[PDB]
Design a protein around this ligand. Structure first.
Ligand SMILES: [Ca+2]
Ligand SMILES: [Ca+2]
Ligand SMILES: [Ca+2]
Ligand SMILES: [Ca+2]
Ligand SMILES: [Mg+2]
Length: 332
């Protein structure tokens, strides 16, 4: 009866590849601009760039001392990695990952941003593609960028970590093992709404894993902060706070109890009186997961005043809320 949620975020062509070897800098940079423009479009267009064999040339252009070339080579591969799971694999096979991981140590803010956006597109594929990013050694660098004073780099590192944490339990464990949780818990107190929202996204995906992955979040100290975000006037921060707690509540009775002990129930029951259907639906989802525990957890929910409001919510105009309230009462 427990629900878990994850969220991910994303012509003479064979001669154009040879044009990258041209001594004329206007010629090699024009071809590189065209190649990147084709890959920005649909999946079929990206596949044509693969067939022309641009990937080994683009991967070699990742060591170019020319910043204008490197910038466009990164933007082209980023567009190539925005495609399908198989197209992303082609970028990995080309040897992009060791070069991109080394590009994370670049003191060039433009290049660093361009590389993070490429790694985030590779991490938005399948679990085979995410594990490739992990095995490349991207995680120690991404966790280090969580302490960066550059708000843009910090946001783009969070983008990559949320995508890595959107994979399997082995992938989420890797993010935990890399030491991401203390840094993410620190970002929950941040006055920057953009940074807080990205850290809420990453933690919610870590919380979507197994009981052990959920416990890591609890031991990290995320709950007091998370319960306080349930009092936020910001609808975006609130939806993400409810998203993280629902995934923590989808764990075991020991995890569900930690949620109760953190003072979530008075806040969750209050959110049931919201005229905002999205907030009410997520508050319901979070309660439905708590009600999926033992008698000790069910008693806490009953004593919080949930029964009264859940009974009243069976008459709601929204059929999705009518259903959610009937499910939660049955559990109780
Ligand atoms: Ca240079
Ligand atoms: Ca700054
Ligand atoms: Ca602010
Ligand atoms: Ca309404
Ligand atoms: Mg530059």
């Amino acid at each position: 009866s427990k629900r878990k949620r994850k969220r991910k975020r994303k012509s003479e062509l064979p001669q154009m590849v040879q044009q990258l070897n041209s001594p004329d800098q206007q010629e090699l940079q024009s071809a590189l601009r065209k190649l990147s423009q084709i890959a920005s479009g649909g999946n079929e267009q990206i596949q044509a760039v693969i067939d022309a064999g641009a990937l080994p040339a683009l991967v070699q252009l990742l060591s170019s001392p020319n910043e204008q070339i490197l910038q466009e080579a990164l933007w082209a591969l980023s567009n190539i990695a925005s495609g399908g799971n198989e197209q992303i694999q082609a970028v990995i096979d080309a040897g992009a990952l060791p070069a991109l991981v080394q590009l994370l140590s670049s003191p060039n803010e433009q290049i660093l941003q361009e590389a993070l956006w490429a790694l985030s597109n590779i991490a938005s594929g399948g679990n085979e593609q995410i594990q490739a990013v992990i095995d490349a050694g991207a995680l120690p660098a991404l966790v280090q960028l969580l302490s960066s004073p550059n708000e843009q780099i910090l946001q783009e590192a969070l983008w990559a970590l949320s995508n890595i944490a959107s994979g399997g339990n082995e992938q989420i464990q890797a993010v935990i093992d890399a030491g991401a949780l203390p840094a993410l818990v620190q970002l929950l107190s941040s006055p920057n709404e953009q940074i807080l929202q990205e850290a809420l996204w990453a933690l919610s995906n870590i919380a979507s894993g197994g009981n052990e992955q959920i416990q890591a979040v609890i031991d990290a100290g995320a709950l007091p902060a998370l319960v306080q975000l349930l009092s936020s006037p910001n609808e975006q921060i609130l939806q993400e706070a409810l998203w993280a707690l629902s995934n923590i509540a989808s764990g075991g009775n020991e995890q569900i109890q930690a949620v109760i002990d953190a003072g979530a129930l008075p806040a969750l029951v209050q959110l049931l009186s919201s005229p905002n259907e999205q907030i009410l639906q997520e508050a319901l989802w979070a309660l439905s997961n708590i009600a999926s525990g033992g008698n000790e957890q069910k008693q806490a929910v009953k004593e919080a005043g949930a029964l009264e409001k859940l009974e009243q919510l069976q008459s709601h105009e929204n059929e999705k809320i009518q259903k959610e309230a009937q499910e939660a009462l049955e559990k109780l």
